[PDB]
Write a protein that binds this ligand. Structure first.
Ligand SMILES: *[C@H]1O[C@H](CO)[C@@H](O[C@@H]2O[C@H](CO)[C@@H](O)[C@H](O)[C@H]2NC(C)=O)[C@H](O)[C@H]1NC(C)=O
Ligand SMILES: [Cl-]
Ligand code: NA
Lengths: 109, 221
């Protein structure tokens, strides 16, 4: 009902409370990198506002080191304009100005 | 037969930890690591080898640069190509580029490769007798990205579906732990800042944990 990819960086989706939004982003943990909320977490900044589930999907490949995909399942729990802000980084190194970022806003009335 | 512990770093077989960066080229680091070790056994000279040479040039053998590859394909390339350049002569760029192999700067060769039987007992004998061994593991878990020290054990690891090429430089056991306390000493290619100076102690004799014995090999020189 709501799917979002890199093509939708910076977009706003209007959703109902309790509705699920699926975010799919390229991700390659074999390079040490993954997507995180600020502070290197996969969890929501505010659980009462929205919840997040995260899962990695390896590619179908006979090779080692092909890129896969991370899915973030976000469920909005209250009225608001919920900012989902992710950064692609090696967690032990942290972010820089150059790091790739993804943002979507989930707006519930 | 084999020793209770082995560590080829202490014998001069192993170059410092390298960094693949944001590129799916660990297969190339695993291959140069194994070849570095066998060349050292042969000549007594440890010379860092070019991962970029493998990334740029081994497409005909089946490799896909920053989108993945296999150590065995890298070993076949070195054989077909009649050589492999030094790290110094052909430095690492972390991107796929045109092939710039120059035979004048070749410092290694191989005559083929040997694949280890899919058992931790066989892997232990190869490590003990041959030197550092190229292996594939299931590295696709956040616990691996966050690894700092101690023996790595991930309950959700697969023995069958591996995605990352690394190098086994030895094995041993933790004095402190006491039931399942054995490990493989594994060189990663994520820089010195990851793990134990770039290394991970992967659980050993815990039912082929993370598939470490499932696709192991080394080059013949
Ligand atoms: C590894 O590969 C080749 C094949 O043996 C070596 O090239 C040969 O070297 C011998 C001995 O010097 C010469 O007699 C031949 O003319 C060479 N044959 C060739 C070029 O096909 C090569 O020197 C070796 N490379 C390294 C880095 O040791
Ligand atoms: Cl890829
Ligand atoms: Na695969």
């Amino acid at each position: 009902s709501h799917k979002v990819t890199k093509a939708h960086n910076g977009a706003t989706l209007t959703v109902a409370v309790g509705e699920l939004v699926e975010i799919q982003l390229p991700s390659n943990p074999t390079t040490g990198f993954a997507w995180y909320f600020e502070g290197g977490t996969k969890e929501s900044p505010n659980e009462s506002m929205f919840t997040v589930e995260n899962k990695y999907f390896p590619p179908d490949s006979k090779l080692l080191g092909a890129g896969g995909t991370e899915h973030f399942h976000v469920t909005v729990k209250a009225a608001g304009t919920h900012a989902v802000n992710l950064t692609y980084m090696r967690p032990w190194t942290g972010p820089s100005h150059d790091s790739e970022r993804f943002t979507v806003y989930l707006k519930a009335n | 037969e084999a020793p209770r512990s082995v560590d080829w770093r202490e014998k001069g077989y192993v170059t410092p930890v390298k960094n693949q960066g944001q590129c799916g080229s660990a297969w190339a680091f695993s291959a140069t690591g194994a070849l570095e070790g066998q060349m050292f056994r042969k000549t007594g000279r440890l010379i860092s080898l070019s991962e970029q040479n493998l990334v740029d040039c081994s497409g005909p053998q089946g490799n896909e640069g920053c989108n993945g590859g296999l150590m065995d394909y890298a070993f076949q390339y070195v054989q077909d190509n009649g050589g492999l350049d030094s790290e110094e002569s052909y430095p690492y760029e972390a991107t796929e580029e045109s092939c710039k192999y120059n035979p004048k700067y070749s410092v290694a060769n191989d005559t083929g490769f040997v694949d280890i039987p899919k058992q931790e007992k066989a892997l232990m004998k190869a490590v003990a007798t041959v030197g550092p061994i190229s292996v594939a593991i299931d590295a696709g878990h956040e616990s691996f990205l966050f690894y700092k020290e101690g023996i790595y054990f991930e309950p959700d690891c697969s023995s069958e579906d591996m995605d990352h090429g690394v190098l086994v430089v030895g094995y041993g056991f933790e004095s402190t732990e006491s039931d399942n306390n054995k490990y493989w000493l594994v060189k990663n290619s994520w820089g010195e800042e990851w793990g134990m100076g770039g290394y991970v102690k992967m659980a050993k004799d815990r039912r082929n944990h993370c598939g470490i014995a499932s696709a192991a090999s080394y080059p013949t020189v």
